[PDB]
From Swiss-Prot:
<feature type="region of interest" description="Transcriptional activation">
    <location>
        <begin position="1"/>
        <end position="207"/>
    </location>
</feature>
<comment type="subunit">
    <text>Interacts with YAP1 and WWTR1/TAZ.</text>
</comment>
<comment type="function">
    <text>Transcription factor which plays a key role in the Hippo signaling pathway, a pathway involved in organ size control and tumor suppression by restricting proliferation and promoting apoptosis. The core of this pathway is composed of a kinase cascade wherein MST1/MST2, in complex with its regulatory protein SAV1, phosphorylates and activates LATS1/2 in complex with its regulatory protein MOB1, which in turn phosphorylates and inactivates YAP1 oncoprotein and WWTR1/TAZ.</text>
</comment>
<protein>
    <recommendedName>
        <fullName>Transcriptional enhancer factor TEF-4</fullName>
    </recommendedName>
</protein>
Length: 207
């Protein structure tokens, strides 16, 4: 009844990735993954500790968690892989058993204040009775492409993790019709070393 992974019984993440394809992939294809989730109870982290890193007026982590449901709420810590005029992409995929029309907002936040939001819709495809929600190869919003290139040219990774300590993403998934929450995901970030590639730990947010 406790989650084993990033999802409810109602809506679950199949896959998420932010990536870059260099322009020479048109000949000899090759992708770089900044972060990547591909899909034993998860460890929990108290949500009140993480209020700092997200805004607190509306669509902030307090008021959504007050609004619930609590089991839809997750924290992901990413270790971003930051070594690599190509294409910059985000691909996300969810799965259900209801036929819903999803709305996915992504709040990019800085010192816990919203800087960019992207709000997409996806209706389901029926595949194996299981219903499938594909938001694939979405262009990365230019704030975060430019953030990456600024970030990557820092001379020390403690400077990078100093920056990313004040950098968060809140991703909010709702049924478009019923206006009810399905899955809300806070993201906190570090830079992994060069030898490491991308990695993640997934938590429940409890209160
Ligand atoms: C813009 N458009 N977006 C929407 C959106 C983005 C960027 C992310 N970005 C993300 C997630 C994890 C690690 C790195 C990044 C990025 F793109 F480099 F900032 C996630 C969700 C939605």
């Amino acid at each position: 009844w406790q989650a084993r992974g990033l999802g409810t019984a109602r809506l679950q993440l199949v896959e998420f990735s932010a990536f870059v394809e260099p322009p020479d992939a048109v000949d000899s294809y090759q992708r770089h993954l900044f972060v990547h989730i591909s899909q034993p109870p998860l460890e929990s982290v108290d949500v009140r500790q993480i209020y700092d890193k997200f805004p607190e007026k509306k669509g902030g982590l307090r008021e959504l968690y007050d609004r619930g449901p609590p089991h839809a709420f997750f924290l992901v810590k990413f270790w971003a892989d930051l070594n690599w005029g190509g294409f910059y992409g985000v691909s996300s995929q969810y799965e259900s058993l209801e036929h819903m029309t999803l709305t996915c907002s992504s709040k990019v936040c800085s010192f816990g204040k919203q800087v960019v939001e992207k709000v997409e819709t996806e209706r389901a495809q029926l595949e194996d009775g299981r219903f499938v929600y594909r938001l694939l190869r979405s262009p990365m919003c230019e704030y975060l492409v430019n953030f990456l290139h600024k970030l990557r040219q820092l001379p020390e990774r403690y400077m990078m993790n100093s920056v990313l300590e004040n950098f968060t993403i809140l991703q909010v998934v709702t049924n478009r019709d019923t206006q009810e929450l399905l899955l809300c995901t806070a993201y906190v970030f570090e830079v992994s070393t060069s030898e490491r590639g991308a990695q993640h730990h997934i938590y429940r947010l409890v209160r």
